[PDB]
Symmetry: C6
């Protein structure tokens, strides 16, 4: 029965933050966790197999599918979630060893928030830069291994585009929210 120590760990790690905002921050974050855990994994379960093209030349389908999608979608969001969760883990380990060492901080928090914002905005910007957020069923290709160009048909364009709509919205509110955190810190400081 020593859950008081971890409760006080949480109290200290989240003491110097906004009164209301961390609530829905954690809520939306676990909202990601659950959706990414179930929905998108089920959605791109057989995506690679589902993709095919009307040509019969061996190799062209693969290279065109590679060019038309250099990055798999689930891959980008899981990297995003993990990499944005990294600073949280860093700071919690930091405070862990802190309370351990005075058993015998603010500017770190600022830096953590700032890099979180930078990583999120950079991932969003590069996603927009490569392919934006809109997508057609039929795709053209331009590759040496096969002549001219092959129209290739996507598996489930509508469902995944609606998904990226939700994900863009939640990314936007996350950006709003960490800007709010930065403003609160800047106003107190």
């Amino acid at each position: 029965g020593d859950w008081s120590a971890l409760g006080k760990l949480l109290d200290k790690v989240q003491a110097y933050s906004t009164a209301g905002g961390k609530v829905w921050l954690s809520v939306l974050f676990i909202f990601r966790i659950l959706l990414l855990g179930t929905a998108v994994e089920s959605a791109w379960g057989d995506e690679q197999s589902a993709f095919r093209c009307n040509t019969q030349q061996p190799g062209c389908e693969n290279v065109c599918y590679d060019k038309s999608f250099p990055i798999s979608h689930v891959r980008f969001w899981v990297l995003q979630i993990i990499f944005v969760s990294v600073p949280t883990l860093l700071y919690l380990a930091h405070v862990f060893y802190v309370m351990r060492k005075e058993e015998k901080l603010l500017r770190t928090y600022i830096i953590s928030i700032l890099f979180k914002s930078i990583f999120e905005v950079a991932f969003l910007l590069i996603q927009w830069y490569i392919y934006g957020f809109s997508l057609s069923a039929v795709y053209t290709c331009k590759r040496d291994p096969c002549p001219h160009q092959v129209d290739c048909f996507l598996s489930r364009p509508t469902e995944k585009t609606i998904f990226i709509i939700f994900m863009l919205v939640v990314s936007l509110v996350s950006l709003a929210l960490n800007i709010i955190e930065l403003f609160y810190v800047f106003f107190k400081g």
Copy 2:
């Protein structure tokens, strides 16, 4: 042995509600949880593969299956369950931080109930708006990529239509029940 604190958390979070109704509320909610966890996931496990059409033109089958089902079914109910569970998580985190802060409310509950009702009724209304709740084995299509129209055959129409019958009924009783909650609050207030 500090389960008394969480018991009193539950006592406080559910103190200002109906005497009888939360019982079968939680029962039907976990009833969803279990059915969605096992049954529908097993049901639409190979739905995309199961769908096929009598034509042989590459691309038409995919676009027609997309148009005839812009949204996968499991997808709609999992989004529903998660999104309706969101306000519960919000309010429990809220009261968590509350008891934490007076360790050193009603109108929120009203708002939570109201938005829960709004989300549920909106999801039901849009589901009816798109395709209602009745479904045939043979489906027509109307798309540019392939000529005329292709009859396409559904995998297991009867089992899933019976499933949506149960799900419509449980949605209706859920609506009944949160209207009852609203009436109880409105009569006390």
Copy 3:
């Protein structure tokens, strides 16, 4: 170390029942749980794929397999188990909130037992009504989408028919047992 409270919860929830019978009631119930968890799920893992018919017309195989089996078997027993487990969950939550409220019943139990019996007997009766409990490898069909009739061959008729033999027997003993409970209550009352 507060397992005494839950022990006394179980004591109170099962106090007004038969001396001997709940033992093998719970035993047979978990017996279901385990068998349904492993055996039947493994048995109907690839049933839909395994089914095929000697005709080549697209659509007829699917509609004939739908008509010949409007309900998948695992589906009926999992719905049965869940739906019969519902009243147990209801009553345990009920007594939970009870002991919680006098921290500051018999006729409910009768009603729970009665509806359990009604649901079990109704599920058994409708299963018999649709297809009984006997089954052949070769099945006829009668549907508009394809001419005349197609003999269709079942995947593993013998193993699943032996399974439904066991399941019918266990359903019968369950019926015996809740009738015994009802008789005990009726004799005490």
Copy 4:
């Protein structure tokens, strides 16, 4: 920290048995549990798909595979393990409620041991009766739906026959051991 109560539960449930033998009884039983959990499940993972016959008539392969194997192997051993574990669960629940009721036996144990022996010997006898314990790669068939007879080839005859050798040996030692238990009881009594 109330593991003393369950320790004393185990002490009482196993008090009136052999000094040495229950040790390797439980060891061999969990030995089953692990082997059945991993090995045989991996072994018959794709058995149904692996089976095929040199004929091309639709239906004959299925009915011949059904006749040549009316029961799947994993199915028989999982039913065996579960059904032999049933009396153990019965008796442990029995003693549970016992110590609960004098909180306010030997002949049962004899009956449990006897039925365990009967079930084990009956399962072994019926397995021998149907197909014994020896098995060839090539199998003949005799069924109306297809003419004459089709040689059908088994997937992995050697590995599974070696497995049934181990399983027969462990069944034999289990029989030895419960006969030893019966002899000890008969000599004390």
Copy 5:
């Protein structure tokens, strides 16, 4: 909070052994556990499907693959690990009941070590006897069901042969180590 009892269980069960050696014994054993849990299972996941031969006669491929590999590889190592873990389980249960009975040994340990060594050396010897530890991509066959002989190609010979190199080395160091245990016991005794 009664982990002291299990700590003292471990103290007693491992008291009469080598000072340094059990450390890396347990380390290498869990090293097996993890590698076998992930790597080899992923490696032979689709081995049976991957194997094929250039002939088209039904049955010959299966019987030749059976003869060329009478035992699947994962199967041999999982049997090895389980069967070598058996004496450990026996002895721990033994000492369990011991401390339980004086709550109201060395020669057993010697026997356990000796049989562990015997089982390990016997498994290694029989593995060498059947096919040694070296393996070619192309394999000949000699079976009645198909004429002459068929060259058959292995799926991933290099990766699995490197794996058996590691496994042979770890088996050798395990043999070294239990011989060291035997020498320590023989020198003390």
Copy 6:
């Protein structure tokens, strides 16, 4: 409630190390753990099936895919992670038995760090030696079983090459960090 003992275990095992560095050491290590657990396993889930070559001669595709990739990628990194985690397990077991034995060190730590560095640098060097870190979609082959040479097309070259970019960077920072540990020890000593 005896988590103080394990806390003091961690305190002692990590007492003689760098003040800041172990934090992000553990962070990046679990970062591996998670990425390897989800991403790469999903990435090479169907790699072997995805690979194919434009020739039709049985056997050549397999041997060419073997030569062009003697080692599967996931296989190398999982062996890396496990084998580098081995010294950590060794040293923690060592200190476990230590505190156990004075219940009735530095140079070991140096050796552990040194071998960790050696294993990491050796794995990186051999990976570079075999195939470096750059990779093309089209691969040539040179094998006796099939004439001349076959161009073979890789499944997803871009995504996995970007992955190995991240993995090379994290390996480099790991090398930096254990060199920092070695420098700190060398300067204190």
